[PDB]
C-alpha cells in the first residue's frame, strides 16, 4: 500500500473503527496524510507532494533562535 499524496510506502494503520469492522484509518508518516479505508481518496495533482516540496515548504510559525 502506497500514500495517495506522496506515493511513499512508509504508510501504516493509525486506528481501527471503535465499533465493529466498519473501517480503518491509515497515515503516511512521510507527509502526515491520513484517510479512511472506506473513502477512496483521489488527491488533486495540485496537492500532491514529493520529497522536494516538503523540503522547501515554509513553516508557521517561525522557530526562534536558541539563546
Amino acid at each position: 500500500m502506497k500514500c495517495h499524496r506522496c506515493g511513499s510506502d512508509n504508510v501504516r494503520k493509525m486506528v481501527d473503527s471503535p465499533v465493529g469492522d466498519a473501517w480503518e484509518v491509515y497515515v503516511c508518516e512521510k507527509c502526515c496524510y491520513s484517510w479512511r479505508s472506506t473513502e477512496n481518496p483521489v488527491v488533486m495533482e495540485k496537492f500532491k507532494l514529493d520529497d522536494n516540496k516538503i523540503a522547501n515548504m515554509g513553516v508557521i510559525p517561525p522557530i526562534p533562535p536558541l539563546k
Binding site: 486506528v15 471503535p18 465499533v19 491520513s34 507532494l49
Partner: protein
C-alpha cells in the same frame, strides 16, 4: 436571560425554539457530516443546528451548525430568537463594559468534564467521531475548539492565560497538529517556550458554552482573560472553570464535553493541511506545530461540537460577525471617542468599514492608523474604509454612496507596502504580508482645503408631516 453552563443546556434551548433537528438515522461520516453542515448554512435564514445521533464507526454523536444562524446567535446571548442584528450588537456593546467578572473556580468533583479520564493507550477516535470536513483536506480536523495556554514567563498571571480557537488536524491516535498563527496570542507564548527549547503545556476543549466558543474567537488584548469576558456577556453571572489535571495555571470550562491535556512539541513542524478555510478556498499545506496528548477527560456520552466552513457565510462567518466588530470598536473608541461604529463582518475582518466623526482635517486617516495598530486589525485588515458619523457602516448601500461622492483617489486612497498580513488571505503574494489600502470616504474638515460644496441637503420643511399624511392617505 437564560444563562448556560454546558453545551447541552444550549442545545436544549435550540430544540425548544425549533432551531435544532435530530438526524436519528445512522450516517457514515465522510461525505455526510460535511454535506449537512453546508446544507444547513445554505438554508439561508433561521438555519438550525444539526445533531447526528449515530455515526457509522463511532460510539458517540456530533452536532454541527450550533452557531450557524442569527437565530442561534441571538439565543446564545439569552435574547429572543428573532432579535435583530443591530439589537444584538447593542446588547454586546453594553455587557462588554462589565469586563472584569472573575470566573468561579469549582471543585473537581463538580466539573462534568472530569467524569471520565483516559491515561492508558490514548485514542481520540474512541471518544471523538472524527470526520473529514472538505474533500482535499489533509485529514480529520477539529475546527470549533477552545484552546487554553498560559504564558511561560508569567505562568501565575491569570490575565496572561489565553483561550482562543485554532484549527487542529488529527495526525495520530495521540498526536495532533495545531495552527499557531504568528499574529495570535498563542504564538507569543510558543516563542517564549521555543526560545528555550521547552514544550508549551496546552489544553484543548471541545463542546463548550456557546459564549466560551464566542470569546475564544474574539481578538481581545493579550493581558485580558477571556473567561472574565464570559462573565460580562452573561450580564455579571460568572462562568464556572476548573483547574486542569496535569497542568496548574491552566483552567478549562467545567462543562466541556472533551478536554485534551498535552503539550506542544518545541522546535518541530510537520506537514499540516491542506484545509478548506473561510475565504472559500483550500489553504495550502505548510509546516506547523504538533502537540502530544498526555491525558483525556470527558463527560459521559460526549458530544462533538464541530463546524463546517467553506465558501463564505458558513457557520464560522456568523460566529465571527460580531465578535470581531465589537472589540475593534471598543479598542478604537478608547483612544478616539469620535468613532461611531465598526463593521468587520466580512471575511473575518480582512475588510473593515469604520464610521466616525472627523475631529480635524485628516482625522479619518488617523482612525485607520489606529485600526491598523490593533491586535486583530494590524495583521488582518487589508482594506480599511472610513465614512462619516452619519453613514451606517453596516449598510453597504450607504458605504457605496460615500465611496462615490467623498473619495478623491488622488488624496483619499492610500496604499502602504510591506505591512503585516494574514497568510490565509489567498491574495497576499508575499504570503502572510499584504499591502494595505486605506480609503477616506469622509467629508473634508479644516484645515484640509475643500473648494467644493459637500454639505448635505436639509429635507424640505414639511417632510416630517408629509410622511404621515401620505401614509394616512394610503390607508384606503
Amino acid at each position: 436571560a437564560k444563562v448556560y453552563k454546558d453545551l447541552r443546556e444550549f442545545l436544549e434551548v435550540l430544540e425548544q425554539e425549533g432551531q435544532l433537528i435530530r438526524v436519528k438515522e445512522e450516517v457514515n461520516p465522510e461525505p455526510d457530516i460535511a454535506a449537512a453542515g453546508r446544507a444547513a448554512a445554505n438554508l439561508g435564514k433561521n438555519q438550525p443546528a444539526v445533531f447526528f445521533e449515530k455515526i457509522k464507526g463511532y460510539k458517540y454523536s456530533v452536532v454541527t451548525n450550533v452557531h450557524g444562524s442569527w437565530q442561534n446567535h441571538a439565543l446564545m446571548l439569552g435574547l429572543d430568537k428573532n432579535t435583530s442584528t443591530k439589537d444584538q450588537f447593542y446588547e454586546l456593546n453594553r455587557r462588554w463594559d462589565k469586563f472584569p467578572v472573575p470566573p468561579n473556580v469549582v471543585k473537581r468533583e463538580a466539573a462534568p468534564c472530569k467524569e471520565n479520564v483516559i491515561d492508558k493507550d490514548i485514542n481520540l477516535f474512541e471518544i471523538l467521531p472524527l470526520y473529514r470536513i472538505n474533500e482535499q483536506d489533509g485529514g480529520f480536523y477539529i475546527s470549533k475548539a477552545s484552546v487554553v495556554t498560559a504564558d511561560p514567563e508569567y505562568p501565575d498571571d491569570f490575565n496572561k492565560l489565553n483561550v482562543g480557537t485554532y484549527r487542529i488536524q488529527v495526525k495520530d491516535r495521540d498526536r495532533v497538529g495545531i495552527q499557531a498563527l504568528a499574529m495570535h496570542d498563542i504564538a507569543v507564548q510558543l516563542e517564549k517556550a521555543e526560545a528555550e527549547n521547552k514544550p508549551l503545556p496546552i489544553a484543548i476543549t471541545i463542546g463548550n458554552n456557546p459564549l466560551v466558543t464566542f470569546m475564544a474567537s474574539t481578538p481581545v488584548g493579550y493581558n485580558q482573560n477571556e473567561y472574565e469576558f464570559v462573565g460580562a456577556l452573561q450580564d455579571g453571572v460568572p462562568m464556572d472553570i476548573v483547574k486542569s489535571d496535569l497542568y496548574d495555571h491552566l483552567y478549562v470550562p467545567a462543562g466541556s464535553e472533551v478536554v485534551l491535556e498535552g503539550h506542544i512539541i518545541p522546535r518541530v513542524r510537520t506537514v499540516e493541511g491542506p484545509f478548506g478555510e473561510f475565504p472559500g478556498s483550500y489553504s495550502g499545506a505548510r509546516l506547523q506545530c504538533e502537540v502530544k496528548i498526555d491525558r483525556i477527560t470527558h463527560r459521559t456520552n460526549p458530544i462533538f461540537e464541530n463546524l463546517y466552513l467553506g465558501i463564505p457565510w458558513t457557520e464560522i462567518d456568523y460566529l465571527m460577525a460580531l465578535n470581531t466588530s465589537v472589540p475593534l470598536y471598543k479598542q478604537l473608541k478608547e483612544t478616539m471617542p469620535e468613532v461611531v461604529a465598526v463593521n468587520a463582518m466580512y471575511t473575518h475582518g480582512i475588510g473593515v468599514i469604520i464610521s466616525t466623526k472627523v475631529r480635524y482635517g485628516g482625522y479619518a486617516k488617523g482612525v485607520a492608523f489606529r485600526l491598523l495598530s490593533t491586535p486583530h486589525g494590524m495583521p488582518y485588515s487589508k482594506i480599511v474604509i472610513v465614512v462619516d458619523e452619519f453613514v451606517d457602516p453596516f449598510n453597504l448601500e450607504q458605504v457605496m454612496w460615500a465611496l462615490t461622492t467623498r473619495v478623491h483617489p488622488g488624496k483619499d486612497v492610500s496604499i502602504i507596502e510591506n505591512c503585516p498580513g494574514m497568510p490565509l488571505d489567498p491574495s497576499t503574494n508575499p504570503p502572510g504580508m499584504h499591502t494595505k489600502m486605506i480609503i477616506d470616504a469622509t467629508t473634508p474638515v479644516p484645515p484640509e482645503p475643500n473648494p467644493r460644496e459637500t454639505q448635505l441637503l436639509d429635507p424640505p420643511d414639511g417632510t416630517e408631516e408629509w410622511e404621515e399624511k401620505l401614509k394616512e392617505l394610503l390607508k384606503n
